[PDB]
């Protein structure tokens, strides 16, 4: 009935058209040292961050979940200045990024000492039931992710924990899988734990251009997500079309979403991309699934009722029980 | 003349009794995730650390080189106020961890960018001679960090930028060697890249107990540290002691200095070491040098003179152009 957003609780069935997977903040584990020379200007973030919201907005957008790690920089009294600004439902998350782009130091030397897997699942328990830090705010999904071609033990103590959590809060599980690996590995490995599929959302699906890989995935039940529109330099959205097409004529509708995986503030020193790597990247904001996408979808004869599906319908069922 | 404390420039004249290597804060990447269960109690920890500067104090400690990394949690602010609790000098650092409990991700990403190594130079510059972030504290070393076996590609742009950075400012490098290996290497890579070996502190050399190593170190001109009094379980302190011995014995004193690269407070969430982990480890304090080693060397007929020489005259000279 109800969903934790960074403004208390919201009914799921007044999300309606949603982003499943957009951070307003990210910043790469390290970011923290490069404080001097990137450090984190609140006022100006915070007007790009509400620019972003007003952009998505524009395009019917009532819902972002910002499934920006624990290690990343989540900061979740930010997203609530932005929501109160904006009025937009802002859905945070609990968890820790994969080994490559994480921090793991931390619950590794907890590792050795014993106690990681209860301290995470205590973790994730104290957000999703109680609040984060001091900010009063609950996360309403819990983020996963893995290495590419292996879930490490590292990350499996996270995905053990989640799957606990999960069994005892009924909260959703979004997950980041690396170059196009782990899809299905992810899936059962939940399962196995005792996770509901239809609590869960396989991430970055679109970095595989085999729609064999994603039927295997889509097997299990659970949701899977095409949330890196924008990103080429990793596959082209040219090639995403045309996975998602594949599926979608398949009739796996009700089981996939859509998303950018924005970054519209990074934390640290800001950086310019090189030539033509930014004129490659020059697509990846918020509203280009509205302005490009979706109308080459609708060129490619996709109904408006299937398209509300995945942004309405899907988040809408995802987050009910 | 001068070296930057955390409380503006001091004569090095004037620093006195020296511990080369303590944490008064300290934490492995990722605990910053670790927010709700191990919250920062910002009171209990100033108490602590100025009980812990008020110990050193009590043998004869006038100053105190502090070389906690950027990413592990280096609080220049807090150790300020240590500072001026105690009257205690405080040297603090610019740097990163090694690659094994450091966070190289968003290095590692500047990397592919192909401005990291000119960003850590500018890093090092502006908190050596600018200020850190916006506390107006400057560091007073470059701190460098290696790991088992090998100096990575990612740590090896930091000793290059350090190398850079201290012909420019004549500033002390103190290094972090990874379970007694790379002492050599460390010296010999700085070395011809420039760097001044009268300005360099090669350390955690007593994880090694072949006085060939040391030797071997030693023969480059720079200084080495015995700074992991008390670390035991995990070399012995009997160990430490004999190799300190050979080298004394030698002649090398005036290369030596001695510390025990304590943390007297750990972010994060707190922790219990098993038995008898935790007997083999109760000797990790800041009085240990001064209560059980400096006695145990006197027992060996060790002068005042010798003494002096690594915990006085040492320190006044690394930090003298
Ligand atoms: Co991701
Ligand atoms: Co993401
Ligand atoms: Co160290
Ligand atoms: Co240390």
Redesign the interface.
């Given at each position: 009935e109800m969903v934790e957003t960074v403004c208390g609780p919201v009914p799921v069935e007044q999300l309606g058209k949603t982003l499943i997977h957009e951070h307003f903040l990210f910043?790469?584990?390290?970011?923290?040292?490069?404080?001097?020379?990137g450090?984190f200007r609140e006022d100006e973030s915070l007007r790009v961050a509400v620019e972003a919201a007003e952009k998505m907005k524009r395009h019917g957008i009532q819902t972002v979940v910002d499934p920006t790690?624990?290690?990343c920089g989540?900061n979740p009294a930010f997203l609530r200045r932005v929501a109160e600004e904006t009025g937009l439902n802002i859905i945070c998350a609990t968890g820790?990024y994969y080994e490559?782009?994480?921090?793991?130091?931390?619950?590794?030397?907890?590792r050795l000492?014993g106690?990681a897997e209860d301290?995470i699942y205590?973790?994730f328990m104290?957000?999703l039931t109680?609040?984060?830090?001091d900010t009063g705010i609950k996360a309403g999904v819990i983020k996963l992710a893995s290495s590419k071609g292996r879930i490490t033990e590292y990350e499996k103590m996270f995905f053990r924990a989640a799957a606990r959590a999960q069994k005892e809060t009924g909260a959703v599980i979004i997950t980041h899988t690396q170059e196009g690996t782990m899809g299905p590995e992810q899936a059962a490995y939940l399962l196995e734990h005792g996770a509901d599929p239809k609590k869960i959302v396989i991430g970055h699906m679109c970095g595989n251009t085999d729609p064999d890989y994603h039927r295997k995935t889509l097997a299990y039940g659970v949701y899977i997500a095409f949330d890196h529109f924008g990103i080429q330099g990793a596959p082209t959205d040219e090639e995403r079309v045309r996975t998602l097409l594949a599926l979608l004529r398949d009739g796996y509708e009700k089981q996939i979403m859509l998303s950018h995986d924005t970054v519209n503030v990074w934390l640290?020193?800001p950086?310019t991309?090189?030539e033509p790597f930014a004129e490659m990247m020059k697509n990846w904001h918020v509203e280009h699934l509205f302005v490009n996408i979706i109308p080459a979808l609708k060129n490619e004869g996709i109904r408006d009722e299937v398209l509300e599906q995945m942004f309405i319908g899907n988040p809408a069922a995802l987050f009910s029980a």
């Open positions: 910043g790469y584990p390290g970011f923290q040292g490069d404080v001097t020379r450090t790690p624990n290690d989540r820790y490559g782009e994480g921090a793991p130091p931390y619950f590794q030397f907890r000492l106690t301290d205590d973790m104290a957000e109680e609040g984060i830090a640290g020193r950086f991309l090189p």
